Design a binder for this molecule. Structure first.
Ligand SMILES: COc1ccc(COc2ccc(Cc3cnc(N)nc3N)cc2OC)cc1
Length: 294
């Protein structure tokens, strides 16, 4: 609504930092407790920054305050009373989707020492996929371009609820999923289309390509896209027109949906609304009802 345009400010007393979650692109990310909003939250910090860096922090808060949807990680507001500056987000119960997918994969089931996890079902994969596509419909409606859509950037809550966020990790500290394109910028090439790699053009359509890769991650239980390849080999495949293989178990319509995300020409890719409609329909016809363990 119109009120979400205005950033909510939070009192410093109401935030208690607990532990570091990882190094972010502009500062440390912490698990914290938040009172009068106790609940667990994740906070992004900005320590002893310049005037321009603090200006950018408020501009990012003004962007996020207005992105509020059922399938978008909740932004609660900021605290700029002291140093560091703090951005507050919800801390989801079941962590990141990439870890979740791997924890429910055939290998995790086979290697479990005690009580095994349940292998993620096709119905559960469809349910996760439709929620991510729903969040992407919302972000496109807001003219927001994500640029780093991947399962590691999705979070899982209770009742297999899934939301899209962006941890915004330091790409220099954690370089596994990033490549220094042109020797200049760290970018997530394995999830990117040819125009984003070659011309650094990011749009709703390059996010659609990434969504296709996220569907591939879901149906492969969180495997790294193009895991058989070096970064330079990945770039050669993407720019030449080779595609990720069909997951062992995937509805054929779902693999064809992925292929539709991977059209070389951005304007010829499947439209986000259509992707969401198809996944929503498949998920409703194969609902989630089995218990999920481990
Ligand atoms: C564009 O809309 C956006 C909405 C939210 C965000 C912030 O995203 C995040 C902010 C913090 C975290 C950290 C985090 C880790 N584990 C769990 N369990 N919950 C968390 N919170 C993860 C995030 O995304 C995966 C970025 C963009």
């Amino acid at each position: 609504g119109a009120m979400d345009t205005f950033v909510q400010h939070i009192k410093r007393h109401n935030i208690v930092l607990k532990r570091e979650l990882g190094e972010g692109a502009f500062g440390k990310v912490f698990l914290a407790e938040c009172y009068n909003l106790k609940i667990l939250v994740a906070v992004k910090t900005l320590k002893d920054a310049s005037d321009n860096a603090r200006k950018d922090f408020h501009r990012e808060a003004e962007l996020l305050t207005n992105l509020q949807h059922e399938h978008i990680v909740k932004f609660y507001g900021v605290c700029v009373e002291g140093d560091p500056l703090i951005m507050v987000f919800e801390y989801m119960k079941h962590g990141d989707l990439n870890k979740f997918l791997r924890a429910h994969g055939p290998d995790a089931v086979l290697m479990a020492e005690g009580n095994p996890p349940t292998e993620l079902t096709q119905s559960q994969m469809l349910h996760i996929a439709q929620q991510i596509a729903a969040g992407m419909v919302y972000l496109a409606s807001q003219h927001f371009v994500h640029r780093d859509l991947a399962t590691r950037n999705c979070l899982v809550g209770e009742n297999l609820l899934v939301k899209i966020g962006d941890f915004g990790m330091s790409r220099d500290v954690y370089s596994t999923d990033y490549y220094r394109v042109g020797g200049h910028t760290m970018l997530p090439i394995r999830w990117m289309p040819p125009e984003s790699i070659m011309y650094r053009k990011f749009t709703t359509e390059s996010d659609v390509w990434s969504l296709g890769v996220v569907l591939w991650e879901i149906f492969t239980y969180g495997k790294q896209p193009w895991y058989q390849l070096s970064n330079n080999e990945v770039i050669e495949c993407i720019t030449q027109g080779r595609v990720l293989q069909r997951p062992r178990t995937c509805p054929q319509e779902v693999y064809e949906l992925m292929l539709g995300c991977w059209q070389r020409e951005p304007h010829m890719r499947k439209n986000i609304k259509g992707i969401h409609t198809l996944l929503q329909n498949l998920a409703k016809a194969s609902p989630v009802y089995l218990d999920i363990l481990g």
